Design a protein around this nucleic acid. Sequence first.
DNA 1: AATAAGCGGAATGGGG
DNA 2: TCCCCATTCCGCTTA
Length: 91
Amino acid sequence: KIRLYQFLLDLLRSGDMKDSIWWVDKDKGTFQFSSKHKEALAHRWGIQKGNRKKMTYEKMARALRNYGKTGEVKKVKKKLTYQFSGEVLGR
DNA sequence: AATAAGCGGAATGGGG
DNA sequence: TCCCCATTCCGCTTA
Ligand code: NA
């Protein structure tokens, strides 16, 4: 099954949900969610995963925080903004 | 207050 | 057994 960080990277590459997520500085790998349209993206993640409950941005961001220590995604000190690692971007 | 983002400990669930 | 990779729940903090 696809990992959350890969799902997000794939969306940014395809542009399928441009009103929910976008690059801020693509060369640096920083990206940001839409305040008003992030829940539709979270819903999509849960449906793709086949999860029992409806996915919310809160639960998706809880999973995102677990990447902080391994490094695939880190929180940036800007509203709704995160950053992929060089390793993730290179693959 | 209302609204919202951000946090993580802990319990629980996936699929090896 | 016991790690993988989350998901779900809850209470708290910060803006
Ligand atoms: Na967030």
